[PDB]
Symmetry: C5
Subunit: 366 residues, 5 copies
């Protein structure tokens, strides 16, 4: 009912978008920024131009994540607003297309790992690409990428089946649970589009991460796992855990509902007499948003995914006002974005319908 | 016949140039900037030198529109002032020559769309080039570019005939009505120069854009259309609409006269006790000249095409004085151009005799 | 014989140099700048090094004119001062050599016109180079460039013979009278060195520019002509006219004497109680030195060519004092040069013996 | 047991780490800086990415020593904390891997000395790489690099046998005793891993450096030796001596014990009432840390190797506090590092278990 | 007089180095700058690495002179201090090796003169290289470069034999007497090392420059000579003359002793109560160190060569203090070097034992 002094819309309105079958005016102004201006908007063209990311100063290694999080948000826009589904499909088509430019995956070759970014490992890239394939087809019904979707899904499936641990590495001896959660979710999307049972591998993965990679008492994942050396980095990560639990909640709700409360105790800091919240990146500090600086942003998505309106309001009251949003000519801009992936992650959280709902998204109007 | 500060000539003077068969002194001073100084004036050489555009900081993707709009203005100078027809012919020759330099069309290749900018799609470029081919021949009677004109017109004609929708896309699945209107307008020019009836396609296109791409109540076109996904971007665009209605008015005057009064109500903001006007780029905002920033400029051209002297005076009183024109050594310069393509569009609007009149331009000598 | 603030030597002194057989001390200090410091002075080396022009921030397209105007000044230096004739020859050799470096002519290729700078058109370049070939041979007696001189003179002669208009274009459909006057002057120099009569084409050319390209009432040429489209840019150009009249005065003095007074009335503004002058680039304006900014500089050369000491003094009182000349360690420098080609054009005007006098220059016997 | 101002932990705590089987909290925070943040931490990936060194402005020629000194510290972390041994192995794996990127060794080729950095000479590079091969196998027990280890050991051994002087040169005619001490130590590591007696060549080398390259009264080595001309640069070097004695102490302790007290008299300046010390780089000056600026840092390592807790405390009270250390989000940072290789050498000194102990390191098990 | 603010050691100390058989502490600190710090010191490595000159902002065309002048000083360090002779030998080895990198000679190819920097002309480069070959062999006794020394010495000797004038040019028609003086001096070095008599051509060269290239009244050489055009640049050059006289003094002492007094009258300006001196680069000015800015520095070398302790002290009192020397960690640095080649030339002048003394240098046997 109320509007904090730096907010564009209430938490109640964002949560009510799907019920009203319409996005809020500030979410529409974000779509305007994404689509409106010729040449320099990010979703103007399927070509290999990245002026939009250059204007925002996005580091090259992060463009792939920017594109993915836009894509995940567009999928929920499609489910929220039938009137906007066609735009979302058009944007997803451009997203898939840009995701394959060498400007996006080229770091894999620059680092010396090879010329093929999908053949082996590099799950940090092809996991998002594979999920984007499926989200696009669920939204649009187009089979444009169906051959490529089935190819990358088979590659992913075979790689899981061959590893003694459950899941896939990004680089040799570098295993990240959050990147695996994206890959497993893409098997569910494929199963939903086809008749397959690629998701059958999800059980062993949840068992594997639950006994080996998670601190059950604090409800937090460790930074990363290294199978060849049997090592686990001894720090628990807030941004890691929030992302993983958000995507897991769409495959196995009970799993994430068990750790979410313990997770909030470990990392979440409520302040300003309960009106604001910020998130510790790791244990043993009171500093907020260390490391990659995304603990608060990803926790905002997790609260949305978990339906935690109180924490969503508290995190947004910390994130948005200091970023100084403004709407000029019906288009959204942030003057002091507080982190990398800022407008992408706030966009995603405001519209996110939950990864489960995207799995059950209805077919298009044919 | 009053003259406010920063205006160089009255609106009555501009509208009376053709009856007097003489351009106004500030239009002559624009022609001096275009032609006078060795090396750095835009029309000094047919070679691939672009110092003039580098001096103005024209983004590379905009040079093709800068060249084209110069060309369209030069065609009207040819019709206005017989004494200048040879000079305008010479400039048109150089414009066509520069339009073919890689520095002008090269973005098509950088984005990954191919090595031939005219073979498929890319109507945003080859449409203007095709029109310039024809306008050059109407002014001069020279057949220098006649073969290329017949080749590109044939490509345009075949591409229209092959599409299930009426028109041609710029990029795969990106349809822009303003870019199609240039291509359709060029078919009429070819018909005037030869006996052809390539213009027969205009009926289907006017029916198509009227049923799918226009908001009949507000008289405004949507930003863009995307055939593959059947999507239409949900924003109406002033610069899209002003440009399209201006060009359609030379092919079907009744069409543009139908929506013009509603277009003005949707986009045009009169202020300063009726002496000035500025234009919204889209609905739902009071900010003027958002998006690419050309709404007021393109509405100035439309007012010229439509014979709306009052609106023309209001827009020029907003656009020109703040740009600080000065005439030094009989050459026109603006100290603070308010947008991209500024001196090009003000030049064009000041001389524009109407796209219908360019089509019905009398033949040259022999 | 008074010296205004900021002037280095009197107009009477510049005009008296040939009679005294010695250049003024400030012309000597300009040659010092041209020849003195290793590596960075413009006439240090025959190699393709251009440090001197980079230090001056000369636009690349303008380098060719810098070299050519230095050469024209060095040719008069040879005629003025026998003790300096050998040095002028050495400098002319360096000038010709640098003139052929790709850094000087390469714009012809960047602009997409081809890989050969002399084969066809481009008279703006090969015309100056052809004149420099001949002036070099006149100064030194050397035949080092005689072959290249005859080849390019034959190239020019043939291009004239083939055109329905009189002269040669720079780019297709770009005809510049000032660039043609350099080319025609080069035919007289070639004829003077040998016995030929290549200069016979000058009659048709002067007939052509007089009937089509000059406004006889105002004594001023239009900016340019464009044969293919039959167009003439409708602005009269002061720097075009001053340059063209100066060189024509060496081939047909009566021609330039007929228009010079009308040129002064059209473009020249005397001010400061008759002590200064500046030149409007075109009609219909009060601005001085618009366009390329060379109207006053070339009119200074024209006044020298015409023997107009009064106008020369007025123009130099406008051009030099604001540039703040100084002589440091016997070398000339300008703190605020007012235009492109500044030290080159003042150099040329101070020593210029007349293009006709250069044609009749005596051998180094 | 008292804590000097600006210090993070006591000298007693650093020295007590191995007995307590735990690193101090600031050493753990240094490991976090090395491992925590995606992409930009130094040991995130085995790829040829060097963002961490670009952020620190490390000169290209110094990257190889940065990696090596990190490696040596991680080896001691393996001995100190069994709980951290697997992570240390993982980091060592990444270290040798990064060590072989052209960005690290490429100066050998840019300087014109050849295309193969291990073929001949260049002991300043392959000496460290070879030691890293063996330390990785000592820590992890992996034979991953065993083949390359034996290849480079034979190269080194054969090069020693062929020279009339004892050792190997860096660039042609550039002999550096410190770079040789690294290679000889790698021969002992190979001997420990296998049965070999490659270390037998160490006797002739110790005799050679003792009669030709050291000033015996001042306990100091000369800058360098140049076999072709028989020349010895007539300056004694503190950083050269500190490094050489430290590594020699692991092969022949008696040698380093003999010169250490003379080295301290020659170069070390105690000040601030015995609470601090800094090191002169050469004789005949009172300036500290001239030349490469590493005399004090390397002497900190030597005091650690020699067990000199007093000098260690005095040097650390001089180096660390002014560098303004802080711990943010459980990660260590220095606001004003005082030299090259700053956090690398302080890290090594704080954990260093002694080069002899690294040789005698037990296998991983229990 | 004591030690003025900015002087590191007295002139008496520099002149006494050879008698004490030991360099001064500031000369040792210069060698430390040359040898101490890994990677960035100029003589760290024989490879084609030039960080040291990039840090000093040495223009590329001057690196070859920086290396040569370092080498000449290292030759004297070898002769002054036997304890440092092995070091000087090693540095000379590095000097020769770096002298052959394309970064040092590449200007010849960039300017368009060819791909071989020693084949023809370019005496400005191969002259210094040839002297360094020989100086290296005298200091060390090594034949490492002997073949190359014999080949370049034969190239130089043949080119002298073919020219109608005495000497070799740098570029076609660019003759510099100071660059010829390096080349002839290298012939004497070859004669001392072997039995040859290549130096016999020195006589014709001293006759030629004495009659054509020097103003005997002012004791000064003109800037340059141009055989093809018979030209001589009409300015006398202090830096040119000081250098030539210093090197000629080692081959024919009487020649330099005759012109030295007049050179001082022409160029040297004493001031500050006899405690300082600065040098005019050319006649007709009071500005010091015009042109390339090296007149005072080269005159410091000449005073050393001539044994003129008073002028040496006066020049050093002008050159060093303003450059703000300091010794940090036993290494010498100048905060405001006053010219190109600053620490190189002050280094050389402080140690220079005389070119004749280097010619008669004893072996290390
Ligand atoms: C800018 C200067 C000194 C001359 C212009 C000459 C010119 C542009 C001729 C046409 O090609
Ligand atoms: C930037 C300007 C003057 C117009 C935009 C034209 C455009 C990009 C149409 C779609 O292809
Ligand atoms: C500058 C640093 C950290 C070490 C010096 C090592 C070296 C240059 C050895 C000889 O090649
Ligand atoms: C291995 C995991 C990754 C590379 C994810 C990095 C995450 C962000 C937000 C840059
Ligand atoms: C031709 C002679 C030369 C190029 C020598 C130049 C001398 C200095 C000190 C730069």
């Amino acid at each position: 009912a109320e509007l904090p002094p730096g907010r564009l819309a209430t938490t109640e309105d964002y949560f009510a978008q799907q019920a009203k079958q319409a996005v809020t005016p500030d979410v529409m102004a974000q779509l305007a920024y994404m689509n409106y201006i010729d040449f320099i908007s990010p979703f103007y063209s399927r070509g290999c131009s990245f002026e939009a990311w250059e204007l925002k100063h996005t580091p090259q290694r992060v463009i792939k994540y920017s594109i993915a999080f836009y894509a995940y948000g567009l999928a929920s826009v499609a489910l929220i607003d039938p009137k906007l589904r066609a735009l979302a499909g058009h944007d997803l088509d451009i997203a898939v297309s840009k995701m394959k430019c060498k400007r996006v995956w080229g770091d894999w070759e620059e680092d010396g790992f090879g010329t093929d970014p999908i053949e082996k490992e590099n799950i940090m890239y092809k996991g998002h690409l594979n999920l984007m394939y499926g989200l696009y087809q669920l939204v649009t019904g187009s089979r444009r990428y169906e051959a490529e979707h089935a190819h990358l899904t088979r590659i992913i499936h075979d790689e899981i089946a061959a590893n003694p641990f459950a899941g896939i590495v990004c680089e040799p001896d570098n295993y990240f649970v959050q990147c695996n959660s994206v890959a497993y979710l893409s098997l569910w999307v494929y199963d939903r589009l086809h008749g397959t049972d690629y998701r059958a591998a999800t059980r062993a993965w949840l068992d594997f991460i639950q006994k080996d990679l998670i601190d059950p008492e604090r409800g937090a994942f460790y930074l990363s796992y290294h199978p060849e050396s049997g090592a686990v980095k001894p720090w628990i990560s807030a941004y890691t855990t929030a992302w993983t639990l958000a995507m897991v909640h769409g495959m196995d709700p009970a799993f994430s509902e068990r750790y979410y409360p313990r997770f909030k105790q470990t990392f979440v800091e409520v302040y300003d007499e309960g009106r604001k919240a910020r998130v510790r990146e790791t244990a043993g500090t009171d500093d907020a948003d260390g490391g990659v600086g995304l603990a608060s942003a990803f926790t905002l998505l997790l609260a949305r995914e978990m339906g935690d309106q109180q924490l969503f309001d508290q995190l947004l009251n910390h994130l948005e006002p200091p970023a100084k949003p403004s709407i000029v000519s019906a288009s959204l801009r942030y003057e002091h974005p507080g982190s990398l992936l800022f407008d992408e992650l706030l966009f995603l959280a405001k519209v996110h319908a939950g990864f489960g709902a995207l799995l059950r998204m209805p077919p298009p109007a044919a």
